[PDB]
Amino acid sequence: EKWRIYEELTNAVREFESINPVRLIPEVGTNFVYSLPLPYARSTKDVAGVKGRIVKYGNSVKAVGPVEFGASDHLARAVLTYMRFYPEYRSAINIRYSREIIEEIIEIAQERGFKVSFYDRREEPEEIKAKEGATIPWGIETAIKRIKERPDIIYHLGDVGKEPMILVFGRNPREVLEKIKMLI
Amino acid sequence: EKWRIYEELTNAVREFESINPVRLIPEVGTNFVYSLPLPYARSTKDVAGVKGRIVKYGNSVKAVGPVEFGASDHLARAVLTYMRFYPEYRSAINIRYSREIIEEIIEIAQERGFKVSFYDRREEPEEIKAKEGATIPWGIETAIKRIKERPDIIYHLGDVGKEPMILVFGRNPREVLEKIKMLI
Amino acid sequence: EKWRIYEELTNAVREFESINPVRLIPEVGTNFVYSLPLPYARSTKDVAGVKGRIVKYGNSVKAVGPVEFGASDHLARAVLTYMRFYPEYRSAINIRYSREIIEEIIEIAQERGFKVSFYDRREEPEEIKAKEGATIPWGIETAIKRIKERPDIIYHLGDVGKEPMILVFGRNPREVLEKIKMLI
Amino acid sequence: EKWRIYEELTNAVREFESINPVRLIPEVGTNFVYSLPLPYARSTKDVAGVKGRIVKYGNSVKAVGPVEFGASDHLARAVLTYMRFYPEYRSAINIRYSREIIEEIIEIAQERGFKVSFYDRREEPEEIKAKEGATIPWGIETAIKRIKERPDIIYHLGDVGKEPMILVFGRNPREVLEKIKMLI
C-alpha cells in the first residue's frame, strides 16, 4: 500500500530529474502523482504528489520538495477522475504544451500505438465553469468520452489566464516515466 | 556593487519568506529581483534574481534556489525596461493577481499615496505580439506612459494561455519588501 | 409620446445613413435606440429601435428595417440600465471599436468636456456570466460606477466570441447623432 | 457564365429566406456566395455574394442587398482557398455556431456520409496572425489538411473579438442550400 506508493513515485521522480527534461516543464511546474487504489481513493489526500512540484532550475529541473499524500491538488483530481473510467491508472504527470511536443507526441502515439484525446474549455458549459473545481473533472470526462479507446494522453490548449497542458497517464509511475522517456 | 546587491536581495528574500506570503504567490512562482545600476544594466544577466523563484510550499512559500545574476528572465526585462524611465528603480517582485489583492492594493496606494498603472495585452499591436520578448517591455511602457506620475504598481489581467500579474517596484529590495508588508 | 419618439429616431437614423459613417459600423451592425420614459420604460419592448439594425452596404451604410418598439434587445437593455442612473438619457447607439476610433473619442472627449468609461468582461465574476443577459446590465453598472461623472461613452474590448464595442449615449437621438458627427 | 451564377445564387438566397432559418443566422449576418471557375476565379471580385448579407429580421431572416460580384470578402476568400483543393466547390455559406447546432451537423454528417473538419485560431502561429487577411486562407488550408477526405463542413470556435462560425460548402447554391435543409 502506502510505502510502495511512496517508494515507486519517489524513485520515478528521481529518475525523471536524472533524464533532465527541461523542455517539458511548464511555468507552473510539473507534478507527478500516484494515487491509492479505489475505493480508498476518495480525495486528493489519497494521492501522493511532489510537494512544490518540479520546476526549471538551471538548464535542468528540480523537485522542490518530497513526495507526500495531498501534495498535488490539480493533477490529483485529474487522475482521480480518470480512475472513474480506468481504475488501474492511478499515476499521471503534467508537462509543458507546444506545437513541437504535441506533434512529436502524436507521431509517437502513432508509432508505439496509443490514444490521445483532449478537451477545450471553450466548449465548456457556463454552469460548469461557474462551479469551482468542476472544470478539471469535466475536461477529463469530455476527453475520455471523446474517443472510443482509453487515452494515455489528454491535453488542452490555453484559455484566458490559463496555460495549456499535456497530461499523460500510466498505471504506475514507472509506466508514466516510460512514456516520457520515449518523448526524448 | 555586486556583493551589496547579492546581500540586500538575499536578505529580503529571507524576510519575504519569514512573513509567509502564501496568498500572494502565483502558480508560475514569485521572483524578486535587484538589477545593477545603469549603464551596466544591459541584460537580464546584469540583474540578480532567485533561481527557481519562490513557490507555494505547504501553507507557506519557498525559494527554490539561491540568488544569482541572470536567474530571472521575465521580471528582469520588466525592471530593466522600467529603469529606462526611472533608473533608480532596479528592484521589483511579481505577485499573484485577484480582485481582492488588487482592490486592497488600490486602497492602500490611495492611503499611503502612490500610483498604480496597468497594461492590457488586448490593446497590443499585432506586430509587437509577433516579435518575441517585445511584449513585456511594451507593457511596461504602455503602463508607464498611461499615467503622469511613476507607477509603483503595474499589473495586467490574464490573456489566452497567460495568467494575470501584479508587479511592484522599488529602488532596492527593502523598499519593495516594505510595500508587500503593507499589503498584509 | 410614442409618435414623437418614433419620428425623432427615424429622422436621426435617416441622417446617420446620410452622413455615411461606414468606418463606424461593426460587423454585427449598428443599432440606434430611443426609450420611453421612466417608469414607462419597463422593458426592451418600451424602447424603439431599427429592425435589422443599420449595416455596412458598399462604401456606405444602410438601415435594414423600420423603427419599431422592441426592435432592439442588447442596446435597449443597455440604455435601460443606464437610465437607472441617468433617467433622462433614453437614447444610445453602438459603434465599431478600434484603437484609432477610441483614441479619437478620447481626444474629442477632452477637447469637448465629455466623459468616457468602460468595463471588462474579464473582471466579470463567473457567477454573473452564468445568468443569461445579466452581463449587459453588469457592464453598464460597472462603467458608471468606475467614475463619479456620467460617462457619455462606455466601451469594452473584445472577449472570446464577442467583439469590442463603443456605446455612446444622449438625451435623445439628436444629442447622440450630434456626437457621432464630431467623431466623424 | 456570370448570368447563370447570378440567377442560381439569387434563387437559392430567395429560398433560404423562404425556409426561414432564423436560428442559423449569426450576429454578423449570413452570407451566401458562388464563385466563377478556375482560373477565372482570381479574386473575391470574381465571386458573387449578397450585398449587406442576409440578417435576422424579426422571427425571420432577410437579404439586405442584391447579389453582386465582389459583394462578399471573407466568405469569398474562404471559398477561393477551398477551391485550390476542390476546384468544383465554388459555393459556400456561413452559419451561426452553437453546441446544439454543431452536434446536429455531426449526427447528420454521420447519418448522411458527410465529412466535417475545423481549425483553431489558437493553434495559429503568431506570424500568420500578423498578416492581414492571411487567417482565412490559413484556416481553410488547416481544416482541409486535418483529414484525408474533403470536409463539407468546416467550423471554428470563438476567439478574442471574433465569434465562432460554421461554414458549409457545395458545388453550387442548390447543393449548399440542400444541406441547410437537412440541418433545419
Give chain D's domains with CATH numbers: 1-184 (3.40.225.10)
Put simply, the answer to whether D126 touches B129 (Cβ < 8 Å) is yes
In angstroms, rounded to a whole number, what is the distance separating the alpha carbons of residues D150 and D152?
A: 6
Grid cell for residue A183:
518523448
List the chains bordering chain A where 3 or more Cβ pairs fall under 8 Å.
B, C, D
H helices present in chain A, as ranges? 2-18, 74-83, 99-111, 126-130, 135-146, 173-182
C56-95 residues touching D, CB cutoff 8 A: 56-58, 62, 64-65
User: Which of B62, B73, B136, B160 best probes binding to A when mutated, by most A CB atoms within 10 angstroms?
Assistant: B160
B-chain residue closest to D124, CA distance: B130
In angstroms, rounded to a whole number, what is the distance separating the alpha carbons of residues A88 and B1?
A: 58
Structure obtained using: X-ray
By CB atoms closer than 10 A (0-12, 13-18, 19+), residue C61 is buried
List the chains bordering chain B where 3 or more Cβ pairs fall under 8 Å.
A, C, D
Q: Which residues pair with D48 in a beta bridge?
A: D34, D69
Put simply, the answer to whether C123 touches B158 (Cβ < 8 Å) is no
Helix (H, G, I), strand (E, B) or coil at A22: coil
**Residue A149: phi, psi to the nearest 5?**
-85, -175
Q: Which of D122, D130, D161 sits opposite B127 (nearest CB)?
A: D130
In angstroms, rounded to a whole number, what is the distance separating the alpha carbons of residues B67 and D151?
A: 55
**Omega within 30 of 0 (cis) for the link into A39:** yes
Q: Which of C53, C56, C160 sits opposite D158 (nearest CB)?
A: C160
Put simply, the answer to whether A64 touches B62 (Cβ < 8 Å) is yes
Helix (H, G, I), strand (E, B) or coil at A62: strand
Please say whether the beta carbons of C150 and C86 come within 8 A. Answer: yes
B-chain residue closest to D122, CA distance: B160
Helix (H, G, I), strand (E, B) or coil at B29: coil
Grid cell for residue D138:
490559413
A107-166 residues touching B, CB cutoff 8 A: 157-164
Show residues of chain B in contact with D126, CB under 8 Å: 129-130
Query: Would strands C54-56 and B115-118 be described as parallel, antiparallel, or unpaired?
Result: unpaired
Q: Which of B99, B123, B158 sits opposite C157 (nearest CB)?
A: B123
In angstroms, rounded to a whole number, what is the distance separating the alpha carbons of residues B180 and B16?
A: 8
Q: Inform me whether the C-beta atom of residue C99 falls under 8 Å from chain B C-beta atoms.
A: yes
User: How many residues belong to chain A?
Assistant: 184
Distance from CA of B85 to the nearest CA of D (A): 29
- Of C39, C111, B56, the C-alpha closest to A53 is B56
Show residues of chain D in contact with B129, CB under 8 Å: 126, 129-130
H/E segment holding residue D165: strand D165-170
Show residues of chain B in contact with D122, CB under 8 Å: 160-161
Resolution (A): 2.7
Show residues of chain B in contact with A62, CB under 8 Å: 52, 64-65
In angstroms, rounded to a whole number, what is the distance separating the alpha carbons of residues D49 and D69?
A: 6
- Of D146, D125, D128, D148, the C-alpha closest to D137 is D128
Rg (CA), chain C: 15
